[PDB]
Each structure stands twice: as C-alpha cells, then as structure tokens.
Amino acid sequence: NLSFTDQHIKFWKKIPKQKAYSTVEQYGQLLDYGRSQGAFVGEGVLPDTNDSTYARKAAFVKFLGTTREVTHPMTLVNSAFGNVIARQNKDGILWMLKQIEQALFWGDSKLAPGGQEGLQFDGINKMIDPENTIDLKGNYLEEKHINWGSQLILQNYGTPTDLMLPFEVMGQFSQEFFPKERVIMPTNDGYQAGVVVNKFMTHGGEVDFTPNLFLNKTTPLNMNASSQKAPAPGTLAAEIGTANDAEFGKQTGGGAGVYKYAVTFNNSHGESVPSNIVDVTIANEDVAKGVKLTITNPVSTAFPVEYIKVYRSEKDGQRLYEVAKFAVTTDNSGGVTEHTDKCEILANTYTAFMGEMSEEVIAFKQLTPMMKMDLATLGPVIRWMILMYGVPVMYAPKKFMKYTNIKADVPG
C-alpha cells in the first residue's frame, strides 16, 4: 500500500458527534444580559428596566455517497490478495473518510446558480466570524501571532485549546528556533540537533499543535478535468475595475506588476479544464482599484455549471493558484457573470486555525453513520453504495480564529 492509512485522519476523529432527528436542527443563543444605561438611582427611587437579547439559529443536513461495482466472473477466479469485495469496501470507506476530512475544512453551502442552497455544508473557513481574522500579508509565522490569536479568543470569553496548521508551516515555525541552540564547552561524542515545538503557553491558556497532512495551501491550476461529467470550458475577459478598496498594495515592494488570470467551471461531479489565460498589467496608481473579470458560460455543455473558481498567479510569476470561489448568476447557455478581484487572498500561501475544541462550541450532527446499501441486479455485475448524512455546527463563532496568507518555504 503506497497510499495513506487510517492514521492520517485527524480532524474527523476529534470533533464530537451528536445524533440528528431531522434535516433542520435548531438551537438558541444568549447574547446580552442587558443594555448599558447606568445603575445608580438614589434613595427611595424606582430604577429603570432592562431586557436581554436572545436568538434562534438553524442548520441543514447534507448527504454524501459513492458507488463500487464488481463483475460476476471476477468473483469466481482465485485472487492472490484475498477477497475483492472487502478490498473494495475498504477503499471506498477510506476515500469517503478523506473527502469528509477535507470537506470539514473547505466546504461552502452557498455555491448554486443565483446563490441558492447548494449541495455542500459549511466548513471551518466560512463559519468563523470575519472579525477574528489575522492577515500576515505574506510573512512567516512567529511567536507573537500565537499570543495575538490567543488574545482574540480570550477577549470573547473563550479558551484556546488547539492549533491546526499544515506540515510546511510547522516545519517553518520550528526552523525559527535554530539560532537559539547552545552548546557547553566540554563537548561529548555525539549530539542530537533540531528543535520541534509541540505546545505553547499563552497569557490566556495553553495551546497544543496538531499538524494535519490534508490541510494544504492554495490549490495550483491543473490542466486536466477531474471528471468526465464536469461542464464544458468557457471564456474569460479581464481589465481594470473601478473599485476603491483593493488590497493589491499590501504586498512587499508594492503591488504593481503583471498577473495571470484563469477560471474553471464546476458542478457537483467535478471540475472542467481551464479557460484561456489572460494577462493584466497593474500600474502603480491602480493598486487601489480591482480587476474586473467577465465570465461566459459554455454554449453546448452536457452538464450545467454551478460555481466558478478563480486562479491568479504570483506577481510577475508563471504558475497560477486558486484565489477565489463564487457561484454563477445563471446556468443558461451563454450566460455572463461579473466579478471584481480585490486581492483578499494571496497566491501560494497557507492558512491555519485556532480555537476552543469543546462540545459546547463545535459539534457534528449525524442523521445516520457510514453505512452500506445494496443495488438491484441490472446484469452480471454486483453493485453497492456507501452513504452518510450530517452537518457540522459551531455554536460560538467568535471562540475561533484563523491566520491567512502565511508564507512557508519548507518544501522548496
């Protein structure tokens, strides 16, 4: 076996699990004890009256599945590596586990024509409150930012417990402690070098480091379609926009340069081949104004489009990485969608998450666990499928945070 095993799944085994009894699950929140109006009254005087604030929220259950098939003659011959049905079941379960692990991070439930309800569920990236975001603008993670995130969490009556980061960021962070090693003069014969940090002590609690093999950087562009059921490619046109709040100038050395742009069309089945590449030149005074993209749907696609991924290259670079993701306006033939890029995410960067991992903050509700179901016999072929229904819920969005645009050079 040259592929990953069950020990490489981390976030799925740690999140708490609860049972679900419907496709809509509701919960209530307490926001305030009263509005601030002063409490000093005076002798024998009737004081004022306060009121509290409450809210009610809901979450929607989604579905996942896959199908495996084995032919009748294959089940009759002798096999060297054991039974084939058990092997196929194991492969299907492991594939589903990997998909669940990554969907718990990068899911999005607003990807549908017109912004309607999609087929995915929301992940950690979208459920965290936008205020608890720290942008590093393309710089290495240091020890200060951990205290910064801990402060962000604790000022909202939380308690940091875990930090989830990719392996490259872990290696880069551990590299920063190398110049702090010291050797005593009467040296022995043989030493162990290299410093690895597993835990951190902040002014608002203690944090544990949890490297994840399936947490990655921005996805690079791929020239081949992920599925034959993906939609057809379209066209792309780009130029300078008219916005006044773009963040192209936040990079080191400014934001003036030449950038490459591309789009890919997506549905629930897979991803299409990339569109034509467009080069856009940004002057020194245009860093405040965004880049406007015009996207045209394919004319004779065999499957409809649902959302669009935007790819951007580095400043004066050649390789393209995914920086944006949004839904189409219409799925009709020759439809036109417009979008303005404001450089919210830099190309070739990483992302990390920290927050309180307790059942009172985050949980996963299961309508049914992973299970198998047989299929009808349409011929001399044995078929079956594997399913799970569920949705993750975060009760306290501001007891989490995330770092964006982290730079790391470990692999290269």
Partner: peptide, 29 residues
C-alpha cells in the same frame, strides 16, 4: 417522490416537509 427539504418557515412547507416536526436542542448556549 416524497422529499424532506430544508425549509424553515412553517407556512412554506409543502410535500414531505409538512410531515417534519420541530427539532430543538434543550440547552441554551
């Protein structure tokens, strides 16, 4: 077929959604 949707408003339920009952967690967060 008979499908259970994601409709929240009780006055917009139709089809299989009319058979669903309310599900509320009993702990206040």
């Amino acid at each position: 077929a008979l499908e259970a949707g994601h409709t929240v408003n009780p006055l917009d339920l139709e089809g299989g959604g009319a058979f669903r009952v309310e599900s509320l967690e009993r702990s206040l967060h």
